[PDB]
Amino acid sequence: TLGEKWKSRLNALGKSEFQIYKKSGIQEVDRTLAKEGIKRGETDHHAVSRGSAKLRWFVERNLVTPEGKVVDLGCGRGGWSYYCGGLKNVREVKGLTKGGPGHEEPIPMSTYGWNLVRLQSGVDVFFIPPERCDTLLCDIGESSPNPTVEAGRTLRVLNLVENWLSNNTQFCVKVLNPYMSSVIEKMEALQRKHGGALVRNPLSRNSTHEMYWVSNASGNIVSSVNMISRMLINRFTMRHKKATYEPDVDLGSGTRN
Ligand SMILES: Nc1nc2c(ncn2[C@@H]2O[C@H](COP(=O)(O)OP(=O)(O)OP(=O)(O)OC[C@H]3O[C@@H](n4cnc5c(N)ncnc54)[C@H](O)[C@@H]3O)[C@@H](O)[C@H]2O)c(=O)[nH]1
Numbered sequence: 001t002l003g004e005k006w007k008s009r010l011n012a013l014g015k016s017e018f019q020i021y022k023k024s025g026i027q028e029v030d031r032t033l034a035k036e037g038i039k040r041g042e043t044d045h046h047a048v049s050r051g052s053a054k055l056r057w058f059v060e061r062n063l064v065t066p067e068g069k070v071v072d073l074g075c076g077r078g079g080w081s082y083y084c085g086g087l088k089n090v091r092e093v094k095g096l097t098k099g100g101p102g103h104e105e106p107i108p109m110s111t112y113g114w115n116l117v118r119l120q121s122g123v124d125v126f127f128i129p130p131e132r133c134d135t136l137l138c139d140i141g142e143s144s145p146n147p148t149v150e151a152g153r154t155l156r157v158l159n160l161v162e163n164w165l166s167n168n169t170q171f172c173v174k175v176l177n178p179y180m181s182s183v184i185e186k187m188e189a190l191q192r193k194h195g196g197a198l199v200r201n202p203l204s205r206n207s208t209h210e211m212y213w214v215s216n217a218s219g220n221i222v223s224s225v226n227m228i229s230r231m232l233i234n235r236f237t238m239r240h241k242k243a244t245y246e247p248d249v250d251l252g253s254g255t256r257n
Pocket residue numbers: 010011012013014015018142143144145146207208
């Protein structure tokens with residue numbers, strides 16, 4: 001596959017060359033003031049991570065429409081959860097994450113709809129019984145310099161979320177490594193069963209081939225993955241290039257009824 005060629009070439013990059021490549025021609029969120037505020041103890045207004053902006057991209061394009069009971073698998077600090085908490089048709093958000101030493105803890109916030117949002121750490125999501133939900137979010141996948149390792153990890157995530165999906169559930173699931181043959185095969189089957197397609201978020205860094213399986217989209221799996229491999233290869237050739245920034249999400253404040 002093209003992605004394997006990309007991955008091989010990425011792994012051959014020198015340290016400085018890699019850091020440069022990672023950010024070339026990508027989108028970034030202006031996070032400085034929000035982070036400074038969070039550290040100050042401020043709980044209104046702020047996204048807890050750059051993950052809120054990342055989910056906003058899919059949502060404002062209608063590729064996923066969170067509504068009702070939202071489950072957020074691998075919530076971390078709660079960026080996706082808090083974001084979803086403020087959305088018109090959302091009634092409940094449950095976010096679950098590892099946390100603990102070495103991993104990001106949920107951050108208590110008072111952004112708009114926070115009372116709708118419950119976050120628990122100390123949770124391995126692979127061992128919890130699926131619950132009924134109207135939207136399933138998952139942002140899980142640990143990168144590896146070996147794409148076969150990433151394939152194994154992606155398949156586990158895919159079989160994970162397959163257990164939480166019913167007939168007309170909204171969804172946005174990170175596909176850590178969408179280009180490996182075993183993952184293509186699984187995604188093809190999952191698309192027959194549940195529709196949606198793989199979409200590339202321009203806030204993703206060049207060092208990752210991640211695409212997101214979103215419910216409200218169409219597209220041949222192979223072609224959509226290949227298009228991104230090509231793009232990522234093309235980006236090796238950019239010289240003295242850097243990210244373009246955008247303002248952060250304002251998540252407001254106060255409770256919802
Ligand atoms: N040529 C390079 N490639 C790198 C480097 N760091 C990461 N990568 C590649 O990007 C991929 C995404 O990296 P990400 O930004 O998600 O960082 P992670 O730490 O989660 O990736 P891991 O694969 O878990 O790597 C862990 C660490 O291992 C080191 N690493 C990983 N791959 C390399 C390579 N190839 N060469 C030198 N050093 C490497 C580097 O310090 C990483 O921080 C990764 O799988 C590698 O294929 C790097 O420093 N040089």
